[PDB]
Coordinates of C-alpha atoms in Angstrom, one line a residue:
Chain A
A41 CA -38.6 17.3 -12.6
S42 CA -42.6 18.2 -10.5
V43 CA -42.3 21.2 -6.9
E44 CA -43.2 17.1 -5.1
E45 CA -40.2 15.0 -7.5
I46 CA -38.2 18.0 -5.9
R47 CA -39.2 17.7 -2.6
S48 CA -38.7 14.4 -2.6
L49 CA -34.9 14.7 -4.2
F50 CA -34.4 17.2 -0.9
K51 CA -35.2 14.3 1.4
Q52 CA -33.2 11.3 -1.0
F53 CA -30.0 13.0 -1.5
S54 CA -30.5 13.4 3.0
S55 CA -29.8 10.2 3.2
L56 CA -26.4 9.9 1.4
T57 CA -25.3 12.4 4.4
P58 CA -24.3 10.9 7.8
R59 CA -26.4 11.9 11.3
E60 CA -24.0 12.1 14.0
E61 CA -25.5 10.4 17.1
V62 CA -27.6 13.1 19.5
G63 CA -28.9 12.6 22.5
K64 CA -32.3 12.0 22.4
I65 CA -34.7 13.0 19.8
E66 CA -38.3 13.1 20.0
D67 CA -41.1 14.2 17.2
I68 CA -43.5 17.4 18.4
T69 CA -46.6 18.8 17.5
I70 CA -47.4 22.1 17.9
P71 CA -51.1 23.3 18.4
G72 CA -50.9 26.6 16.1
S73 CA -53.4 29.8 15.0
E74 CA -53.9 27.6 11.6
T75 CA -52.5 24.5 11.9
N76 CA -51.3 21.6 14.0
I77 CA -47.4 22.5 13.5
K78 CA -45.4 19.5 13.4
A79 CA -42.0 20.3 14.4
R80 CA -38.7 17.5 15.7
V81 CA -37.1 18.1 19.2
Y82 CA -33.5 17.7 19.1
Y83 CA -31.7 16.8 23.1
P84 CA -27.8 17.3 23.1
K85 CA -25.5 14.3 24.7
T86 CA -24.3 16.8 27.3
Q87 CA -26.6 17.1 30.7
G88 CA -29.1 19.6 30.7
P89 CA -30.2 22.6 31.6
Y90 CA -30.2 23.7 28.4
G91 CA -30.3 26.9 26.0
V92 CA -33.4 26.4 23.5
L93 CA -32.6 27.1 19.5
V94 CA -35.6 27.2 17.0
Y95 CA -34.7 26.5 13.9
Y96 CA -36.3 27.5 10.1
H97 CA -34.8 25.1 7.2
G98 CA -34.3 26.6 4.2
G99 CA -35.6 26.1 0.6
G100 CA -37.1 29.2 -1.4
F101 CA -40.2 28.8 1.0
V102 CA -41.7 25.6 -1.2
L103 CA -38.4 22.8 -0.8
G104 CA -36.7 21.2 2.3
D105 CA -38.6 20.0 5.6
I106 CA -37.6 18.4 8.6
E107 CA -36.0 15.2 6.8
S108 CA -34.2 16.4 4.7
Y109 CA -32.9 19.0 7.1
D110 CA -32.4 16.2 10.3
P111 CA -28.6 15.3 9.3
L112 CA -28.1 19.9 9.6
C113 CA -29.9 20.2 12.4
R114 CA -28.2 16.7 14.1
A115 CA -25.0 18.4 13.7
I116 CA -25.7 21.9 14.8
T117 CA -26.5 20.5 18.4
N118 CA -24.0 18.3 19.2
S119 CA -22.3 21.7 18.0
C120 CA -24.0 24.4 19.8
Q121 CA -25.2 21.9 23.0
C122 CA -28.3 22.7 23.0
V123 CA -31.5 21.5 22.8
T124 CA -32.4 21.8 18.6
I125 CA -36.0 22.5 18.1
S126 CA -36.6 22.3 13.4
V127 CA -40.5 23.4 12.6
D128 CA -41.9 22.1 9.8
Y129 CA -43.6 25.3 8.9
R130 CA -46.5 25.0 6.0
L131 CA -45.1 25.0 2.5
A132 CA -46.2 27.4 -1.2
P133 CA -47.3 27.5 -3.3
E134 CA -50.0 25.1 -1.2
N135 CA -49.8 27.9 1.0
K136 CA -49.0 31.4 0.3
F137 CA -47.8 34.1 2.5
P138 CA -48.0 34.8 5.1
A139 CA -48.3 31.0 6.3
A140 CA -44.5 30.6 6.3
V141 CA -44.5 32.7 9.0
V142 CA -47.6 32.8 11.0
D143 CA -46.4 29.0 11.6
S144 CA -42.4 30.0 12.5
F145 CA -44.2 32.7 14.7
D146 CA -46.6 30.5 16.7
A147 CA -43.5 27.5 17.0
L148 CA -41.1 30.4 18.6
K149 CA -43.7 31.3 20.9
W150 CA -44.9 27.7 21.7
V151 CA -41.6 27.5 22.6
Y152 CA -41.0 30.3 24.6
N153 CA -43.8 29.1 26.1
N154 CA -43.8 25.7 27.2
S155 CA -39.7 25.7 27.8
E156 CA -39.5 23.8 30.9
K157 CA -40.8 21.3 28.5
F158 CA -37.1 20.8 27.1
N159 CA -35.8 21.9 30.7
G160 CA -34.8 25.1 28.7
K161 CA -33.3 27.6 31.8
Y162 CA -30.9 28.9 29.6
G163 CA -33.0 30.1 27.0
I164 CA -34.4 30.8 23.7
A165 CA -33.0 31.6 20.5
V166 CA -33.9 31.2 16.5
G167 CA -32.4 30.3 13.4
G168 CA -32.0 29.7 9.6
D169 CA -30.5 28.9 6.3
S170 CA -31.6 30.8 3.8
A171 CA -35.2 31.4 3.9
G172 CA -35.3 29.8 6.9
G173 CA -33.1 32.9 8.0
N174 CA -35.2 35.2 6.9
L175 CA -38.2 32.7 9.0
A176 CA -36.0 33.6 11.9
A177 CA -34.6 37.4 11.1
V178 CA -39.0 37.5 11.1
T179 CA -39.8 35.9 13.5
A180 CA -37.4 37.5 15.9
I181 CA -38.9 41.4 14.9
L182 CA -42.3 39.2 15.7
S183 CA -41.1 38.8 19.0
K184 CA -39.9 42.2 20.1
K185 CA -43.4 43.2 19.1
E186 CA -44.4 40.8 22.0
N187 CA -42.7 41.7 24.9
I188 CA -40.8 37.8 24.0
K189 CA -37.2 38.6 24.2
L190 CA -34.9 35.8 22.8
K191 CA -31.0 35.5 23.2
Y192 CA -30.4 35.2 19.8
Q193 CA -30.6 35.1 16.5
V194 CA -28.4 33.3 14.1
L195 CA -28.8 34.0 10.2
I196 CA -27.0 31.3 7.5
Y197 CA -27.2 33.3 4.3
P198 CA -29.8 34.8 4.7
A199 CA -33.3 36.2 2.2
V200 CA -34.0 39.6 3.5
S201 CA -35.1 42.2 1.1
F202 CA -36.7 41.6 -3.0
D203 CA -34.0 42.6 -5.0
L204 CA -32.8 44.0 -8.6
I205 CA -30.4 46.5 -8.1
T206 CA -27.5 45.0 -5.2
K207 CA -24.2 44.0 -7.4
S208 CA -23.4 40.2 -5.7
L209 CA -27.4 39.7 -6.9
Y210 CA -25.5 40.7 -10.8
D211 CA -22.5 38.9 -10.0
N212 CA -23.9 35.9 -8.9
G213 CA -26.9 35.4 -10.4
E214 CA -26.3 32.2 -13.0
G215 CA -23.5 29.6 -12.2
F216 CA -23.7 29.6 -8.3
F217 CA -26.0 27.1 -7.8
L218 CA -29.7 29.8 -6.5
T219 CA -29.7 31.1 -9.5
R220 CA -32.1 34.5 -10.7
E221 CA -34.3 31.9 -12.7
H222 CA -35.1 30.3 -8.8
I223 CA -35.2 33.9 -6.8
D224 CA -37.8 34.9 -9.2
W225 CA -39.7 31.4 -9.6
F226 CA -39.9 30.9 -5.4
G227 CA -41.0 34.5 -5.2
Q228 CA -43.5 33.9 -7.0
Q229 CA -44.9 30.1 -5.5
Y230 CA -44.8 32.4 -2.2
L231 CA -46.0 35.8 -2.0
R232 CA -50.2 36.6 -3.1
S233 CA -49.4 40.0 -4.2
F234 CA -47.2 42.5 -5.5
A235 CA -48.2 44.9 -2.9
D236 CA -46.9 42.3 -0.5
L237 CA -43.3 43.4 -1.8
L238 CA -43.9 46.5 1.1
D239 CA -44.2 43.4 3.7
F240 CA -41.4 43.5 6.4
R241 CA -42.6 40.3 6.7
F242 CA -41.2 38.7 3.8
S243 CA -38.1 41.9 3.2
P244 CA -37.5 42.2 7.3
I245 CA -35.1 44.6 5.5
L246 CA -37.9 47.2 6.0
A247 CA -38.7 46.7 10.1
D248 CA -37.3 49.1 13.0
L249 CA -34.2 47.0 14.1
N250 CA -33.6 48.8 17.1
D251 CA -33.8 46.6 19.9
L252 CA -33.4 42.8 18.0
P253 CA -31.2 39.8 20.5
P254 CA -27.9 39.8 19.2
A255 CA -26.9 38.2 15.8
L256 CA -24.2 35.8 14.1
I257 CA -24.9 36.2 9.9
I258 CA -23.4 33.9 7.6
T259 CA -22.5 35.2 4.0
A260 CA -21.3 33.4 1.4
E261 CA -18.9 35.1 -1.3
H262 CA -20.4 33.6 -4.7
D263 CA -24.0 34.0 -3.9
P264 CA -25.9 36.1 -5.2
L265 CA -27.5 37.2 -1.7
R266 CA -24.3 38.0 0.1
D267 CA -24.8 42.0 -0.2
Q268 CA -28.2 41.9 1.5
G269 CA -26.8 39.7 4.1
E270 CA -24.3 42.2 5.0
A271 CA -26.9 44.9 4.8
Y272 CA -28.9 42.5 7.7
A273 CA -26.2 43.1 9.4
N274 CA -25.0 46.5 9.1
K275 CA -28.4 48.3 9.5
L276 CA -29.3 46.0 12.9
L277 CA -25.6 47.7 14.0
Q278 CA -26.6 50.6 12.8
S279 CA -30.1 50.5 15.3
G280 CA -27.5 49.3 17.9
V281 CA -27.7 45.3 17.8
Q282 CA -24.7 43.8 18.0
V283 CA -23.9 41.7 15.2
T284 CA -20.9 39.1 14.2
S285 CA -20.5 39.0 10.5
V286 CA -18.6 37.2 8.6
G287 CA -18.4 36.3 5.0
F288 CA -17.1 32.8 4.2
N289 CA -14.9 32.9 1.0
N290 CA -14.7 30.8 -1.6
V291 CA -18.2 29.4 -1.1
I292 CA -21.8 29.0 -2.9
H293 CA -24.8 29.8 -1.4
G294 CA -26.2 26.7 0.5
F295 CA -22.8 26.4 1.5
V296 CA -23.9 24.8 5.2
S297 CA -26.1 22.4 4.2
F298 CA -23.4 19.9 2.4
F299 CA -21.1 20.2 5.4
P300 CA -19.9 16.9 5.1
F301 CA -18.1 17.5 2.2
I302 CA -17.7 21.3 2.2
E303 CA -14.9 21.7 4.9
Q304 CA -16.4 25.6 5.3
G305 CA -19.6 24.6 5.6
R306 CA -18.6 22.0 9.2
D307 CA -16.5 25.3 10.4
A308 CA -19.7 27.3 9.7
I309 CA -21.3 24.9 12.5
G310 CA -18.3 25.2 14.5
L311 CA -18.5 28.8 14.8
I312 CA -22.1 28.8 15.1
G313 CA -21.7 26.2 17.9
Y314 CA -19.8 28.7 19.3
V315 CA -21.3 31.6 19.6
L316 CA -24.5 29.8 21.3
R317 CA -22.5 27.7 23.9
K318 CA -21.2 31.4 24.4
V319 CA -24.8 33.4 24.6
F320 CA -26.7 30.6 26.4
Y321 CA -23.9 29.1 28.7
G322 CA -20.9 31.7 28.9
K323 CA -18.5 29.0 27.5
Chain B
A41 CA 8.2 58.7 20.3
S42 CA 10.8 56.4 20.7
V43 CA 10.4 53.0 19.3
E44 CA 10.9 52.2 23.6
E45 CA 8.1 54.2 24.4
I46 CA 5.6 52.7 21.6
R47 CA 6.7 48.9 23.0
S48 CA 5.7 50.4 26.8
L49 CA 1.9 52.1 25.9
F50 CA 1.1 48.7 24.2
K51 CA 2.4 46.7 27.7
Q52 CA 0.7 49.2 29.7
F53 CA -2.1 49.2 27.8
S54 CA -2.5 45.4 27.8
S55 CA -1.8 45.5 31.6
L56 CA -5.4 46.1 32.5
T57 CA -7.1 43.3 31.3
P58 CA -8.6 41.0 32.9
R59 CA -6.5 37.4 32.0
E60 CA -8.7 34.4 32.0
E61 CA -7.3 31.5 34.3
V62 CA -6.2 28.9 32.1
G63 CA -4.3 25.4 34.3
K64 CA -0.9 25.8 34.1
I65 CA 1.6 27.9 32.9
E66 CA 5.8 27.4 32.0
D67 CA 7.9 29.9 30.9
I68 CA 10.9 28.1 29.2
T69 CA 14.1 29.6 27.2
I70 CA 14.8 28.0 23.9
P71 CA 17.9 26.9 22.6
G72 CA 17.7 28.8 19.1
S73 CA 20.3 28.7 16.2
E74 CA 21.2 32.8 16.8
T75 CA 19.9 33.4 20.6
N76 CA 17.7 31.9 23.9
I77 CA 14.3 32.2 23.2
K78 CA 12.2 32.8 25.8
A79 CA 8.8 31.3 25.4
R80 CA 5.7 30.8 27.1
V81 CA 3.6 27.9 27.4
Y82 CA -0.1 27.2 28.3
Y83 CA -1.7 24.3 29.6
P84 CA -5.6 24.1 28.9
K85 CA -7.9 23.3 32.0
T86 CA -9.0 19.2 30.5
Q87 CA -6.1 16.4 30.4
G88 CA -3.9 15.8 27.8
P89 CA -2.9 14.4 25.7
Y90 CA -3.1 17.5 23.5
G91 CA -2.5 19.1 20.3
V92 CA 0.5 22.0 20.5
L93 CA -0.2 25.7 19.3
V94 CA 3.1 28.0 18.7
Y95 CA 1.9 31.2 18.3
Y96 CA 3.5 34.1 17.1
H97 CA 2.1 37.5 18.4
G98 CA 2.3 40.9 15.7
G99 CA 3.0 44.2 16.4
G100 CA 4.4 44.7 13.0
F101 CA 7.7 43.1 13.8
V102 CA 9.1 45.8 16.4
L103 CA 6.4 45.6 19.3
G104 CA 4.3 43.2 21.0
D105 CA 5.7 40.5 22.9
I106 CA 5.0 37.8 25.4
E107 CA 4.0 39.7 28.5
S108 CA 1.4 42.2 26.7
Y109 CA 0.2 38.7 24.8
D110 CA -1.0 37.5 26.9
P111 CA -4.7 38.1 27.7
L112 CA -4.9 37.0 24.3
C113 CA -3.1 33.3 24.4
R114 CA -4.9 32.4 27.7
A115 CA -8.1 33.0 25.5
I116 CA -6.7 31.0 23.0
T117 CA -5.2 28.2 25.0
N118 CA -9.2 28.0 26.8
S119 CA -10.7 28.4 23.5
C120 CA -8.8 25.5 21.8
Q121 CA -8.2 23.5 24.2
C122 CA -4.1 22.5 23.2
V123 CA -1.2 24.0 24.1
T124 CA -0.4 27.2 23.6
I125 CA 3.3 28.3 23.2
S126 CA 4.1 32.4 23.0
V127 CA 7.1 33.2 21.1
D128 CA 9.5 35.9 21.9
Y129 CA 11.4 36.8 18.9
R130 CA 13.5 38.7 18.3
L131 CA 12.6 42.3 17.9
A132 CA 13.4 44.8 15.5
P133 CA 14.4 47.5 14.7
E134 CA 17.1 46.4 17.3
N135 CA 17.6 43.2 15.2
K136 CA 16.0 43.2 11.3
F137 CA 14.8 41.1 9.3
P138 CA 15.2 37.8 9.3
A139 CA 15.9 38.1 13.6
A140 CA 11.8 37.3 13.7
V141 CA 11.7 34.9 11.1
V142 CA 14.9 32.5 12.5
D143 CA 13.6 32.9 16.0
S144 CA 9.8 31.8 14.1
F145 CA 11.3 28.7 12.8
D146 CA 14.1 27.7 15.4
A147 CA 11.3 27.7 18.1
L148 CA 8.9 25.7 15.9
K149 CA 11.8 23.4 15.1
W150 CA 12.5 22.5 19.3
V151 CA 8.5 22.2 20.2
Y152 CA 8.2 19.5 17.0
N153 CA 11.0 17.8 17.9
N154 CA 10.6 18.0 21.8
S155 CA 6.4 18.0 21.8
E156 CA 6.3 15.1 24.8
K157 CA 8.2 17.5 26.4
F158 CA 4.6 19.0 26.6
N159 CA 2.1 15.6 26.5
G160 CA 1.7 16.6 22.8
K161 CA 0.8 13.7 20.7
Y162 CA -2.3 15.1 18.9
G163 CA 0.2 16.9 17.0
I164 CA 1.7 20.8 16.2
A165 CA 0.3 23.7 14.2
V166 CA 1.2 27.2 13.8
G167 CA -0.3 30.5 14.5
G168 CA -0.2 34.7 14.4
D169 CA -1.7 37.5 13.8
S170 CA -0.4 40.5 12.1
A171 CA 3.5 40.5 11.6
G172 CA 2.7 37.2 14.0
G173 CA 0.5 35.1 10.7
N174 CA 3.6 37.0 8.4
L175 CA 5.6 34.7 10.6
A176 CA 3.7 31.3 11.7
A177 CA 3.3 31.6 7.1
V178 CA 6.7 31.8 6.7
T179 CA 7.7 29.1 9.4
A180 CA 5.3 27.1 7.4
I181 CA 6.5 27.2 4.7
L182 CA 10.0 26.2 6.1
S183 CA 9.0 23.8 7.9
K184 CA 7.6 22.0 4.2
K185 CA 11.5 22.4 3.1
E186 CA 12.4 20.5 6.3
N187 CA 10.2 17.1 6.3
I188 CA 8.6 19.1 9.3
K189 CA 4.5 18.0 9.3
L190 CA 2.2 20.3 10.9
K191 CA -1.4 19.8 11.3
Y192 CA -2.5 23.4 10.8
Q193 CA -1.4 27.3 10.3
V194 CA -4.1 30.0 11.3
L195 CA -3.8 32.9 10.0
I196 CA -4.8 36.0 11.4
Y197 CA -5.3 39.6 9.3
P198 CA -1.2 38.3 7.9
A199 CA 0.8 40.4 6.2
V200 CA 1.7 38.4 3.1
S201 CA 3.5 40.7 0.8
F202 CA 5.0 44.2 -0.3
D203 CA 1.8 45.8 -1.5
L204 CA 1.5 49.3 -3.9
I205 CA -1.4 48.5 -5.2
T206 CA -4.5 46.3 -3.6
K207 CA -8.0 47.4 -3.6
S208 CA -7.7 47.1 0.0
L209 CA -4.9 49.1 0.8
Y210 CA -5.8 52.2 -0.7
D211 CA -9.8 51.5 0.6
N212 CA -8.7 51.2 4.4
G213 CA -4.8 52.8 3.9
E214 CA -6.1 55.5 6.6
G215 CA -7.8 56.0 9.7
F216 CA -8.1 52.3 10.3
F217 CA -6.2 51.9 12.8
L218 CA -3.2 50.9 11.6
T219 CA -2.3 52.9 8.7
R220 CA 0.0 52.9 5.3
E221 CA 2.2 55.5 7.5
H222 CA 2.7 52.2 10.1
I223 CA 3.0 50.2 7.1
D224 CA 5.7 52.2 5.9
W225 CA 7.6 52.6 9.0
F226 CA 7.4 48.9 10.1
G227 CA 8.8 48.0 6.9
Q228 CA 12.0 50.1 7.3
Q229 CA 11.9 49.4 10.3
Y230 CA 12.3 45.5 10.1
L231 CA 13.9 44.8 6.6
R232 CA 18.0 45.6 5.4
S233 CA 17.3 46.7 2.2
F234 CA 15.0 46.3 -1.4
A235 CA 16.6 43.3 -1.8
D236 CA 14.7 41.4 1.1
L237 CA 11.7 42.7 -0.8
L238 CA 12.1 39.5 -3.2
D239 CA 12.6 36.9 -0.3
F240 CA 9.6 35.3 0.9
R241 CA 11.1 35.1 4.1
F242 CA 9.4 38.3 3.8
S243 CA 6.5 37.9 1.5
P244 CA 5.4 34.5 1.7
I245 CA 2.5 34.8 -1.4
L246 CA 6.2 34.4 -3.4
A247 CA 6.8 30.9 -2.0
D248 CA 5.3 27.9 -3.8
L249 CA 2.2 27.1 -1.8
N250 CA 2.0 23.3 -2.1
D251 CA 1.5 20.7 0.6
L252 CA 1.3 23.7 2.8
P253 CA -0.9 22.5 5.7
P254 CA -4.9 23.3 5.9
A255 CA -5.7 26.8 7.3
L256 CA -7.5 29.2 8.8
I257 CA -7.6 32.8 7.3
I258 CA -9.6 35.5 9.0
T259 CA -8.8 39.2 7.5
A260 CA -11.0 42.2 8.1
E261 CA -13.3 44.5 5.9
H262 CA -11.4 47.0 7.0
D263 CA -8.0 46.7 7.1
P264 CA -5.4 47.8 4.3
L265 CA -4.1 43.6 4.3
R266 CA -6.9 42.6 3.7
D267 CA -6.9 41.6 -0.2
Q268 CA -3.0 40.0 0.3
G269 CA -4.9 38.1 3.1
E270 CA -7.7 37.1 0.5
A271 CA -4.8 36.5 -2.3
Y272 CA -2.9 33.9 0.5
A273 CA -6.4 31.5 0.4
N274 CA -7.0 31.4 -2.6
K275 CA -3.1 30.9 -3.9
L276 CA -3.0 28.2 -0.8
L277 CA -6.6 26.4 -2.4
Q278 CA -5.2 26.7 -6.5
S279 CA -2.1 25.2 -4.7
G280 CA -4.3 22.2 -3.2
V281 CA -4.5 23.1 0.4
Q282 CA -7.5 23.0 2.4
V283 CA -8.5 26.6 3.7
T284 CA -11.1 28.2 5.2
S285 CA -11.2 32.2 4.8
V286 CA -13.7 34.3 6.3
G287 CA -13.4 38.2 6.2
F288 CA -15.1 39.2 9.4
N289 CA -16.9 42.4 8.4
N290 CA -17.3 46.0 10.6
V291 CA -13.5 45.8 11.5
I292 CA -10.4 47.1 11.1
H293 CA -7.0 45.1 11.5
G294 CA -6.1 44.0 15.5
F295 CA -10.1 43.2 16.4
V296 CA -8.6 40.2 17.9
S297 CA -6.9 42.1 20.7
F298 CA -9.6 44.2 21.4
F299 CA -12.0 40.9 22.1
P300 CA -12.8 42.1 25.9
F301 CA -14.7 45.5 24.5
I302 CA -15.5 44.2 20.9
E303 CA -17.5 41.0 20.7
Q304 CA -16.3 40.1 16.9
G305 CA -12.5 39.4 18.9
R306 CA -14.0 37.2 21.0
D307 CA -15.7 34.8 18.3
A308 CA -12.7 34.9 16.2
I309 CA -11.1 33.8 18.9
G310 CA -14.3 31.0 19.3
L311 CA -13.6 29.7 15.5
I312 CA -9.9 29.4 15.8
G313 CA -10.7 26.9 19.4
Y314 CA -13.1 25.1 17.0
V315 CA -10.8 24.5 13.9
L316 CA -8.3 23.3 15.9
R317 CA -9.9 21.4 18.3
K318 CA -11.9 19.8 15.1
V319 CA -8.5 19.0 13.9
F320 CA -6.2 17.6 16.9
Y321 CA -9.1 16.6 18.4
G322 CA -11.8 15.5 15.7
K323 CA -14.0 17.9 17.8

């Protein structure tokens, strides 16, 4: 299958997954520094004011998009009772690193600076899964540098480092959906050169993690990325940031996308909904 | 310190803790097969009908009680929006095994048979922490044997087997609050003879776990009981029961009791609240 064929397959497979009703949906265009960034705004069924979660889909920086991630963002919106804004950041290999990062940060900054459009008086969080978790994490680092004060970051099995050494990478690098071969190939599509392996915007574990927002970090037992997720939680904790780091057992990378039929995914979405309701609303 | 003093220190420290408002509290006395069993019934602030969680406190079969667990049970009640019934089962060494089990199951049967008293139309679940998670699990096994249909079981770092072999026992058996010496001492207070190590009512891992209620099993990373909790989840899964097994990283046995200070305990209570709202209310 071509990259285009796989991008299409993601959208097709999404139509098998039920889309929860939400309050109201709007498609908007965010004026970025390098491009106009499509985003989809989901309102919950409750009355505002709201907190706002800026969400970055996963897909190895190459795949996925607002449509294929529409069922998951509806479910998150209903769970957190919060406005969710799903960002269509530029993809590789058409747009190399750091295009995804530039778009992700530009979208966050715009949302932070325009939160009243969404009645977003209870503050802004970031979240994402896999490569999207990488972008949420990097966006939070970049926000600190610009004095943008986020409430929370939700990192769902994030990619946080180039890795040739964790035990989970070797234990779980074949047979569990996301393989070594995929991880290598995505990296080749996304990065410009070996030097980018020194860049915190690709490997956020490299950054100084002091003063970042408090985090929920979800890892999966049978996931080659498990150990590096835990490492990111640990380095946050060592840096004085509050982190709830939870390993969901018996599940594989991606499991939250498969919530309709992997019940642990549904429960993960319930946990995400709880922490954001707590941080935004005191509930 | 005598048993009395150890109990009183526990009650002392729990006295300090702000208690969340709930809807309504009723103390009741359940006519048990061997004793009168005090229970405390917590109503949420929502209106009914309800699900009902029958909850067994931890404390190594020797300590804890309704009063000392009152702050936790209030928090759980508000999180699950469900009627919570905290059971004052008989303690060891005064009452040896299987007294705690007899009381825990007698209470559950009585609640099940009297569900209308609590407006409990959405069914009955069991839950507990530590020794209380042991009692919840054993109660669910005994319920199946007598055709009592429970909705769910919430096992919070349960004790499920006598253990001289798990890696977590050796890695975490000192320095993390619950020690080998404590495990030994509680078992000595509770059990009558070595024969009781063969009894599934002490080590529920021995039972046939087919057809038991779906479960949420929470384990703690730095807990000597971590691996045996995971084993219980995995044995349930092998036996066709749906289980969400979540390891909370960076925390120790008992962490949910410390929710006012350890934010991961609060988030665990959120998760417990979610799964029970889901199973009772579809929410």
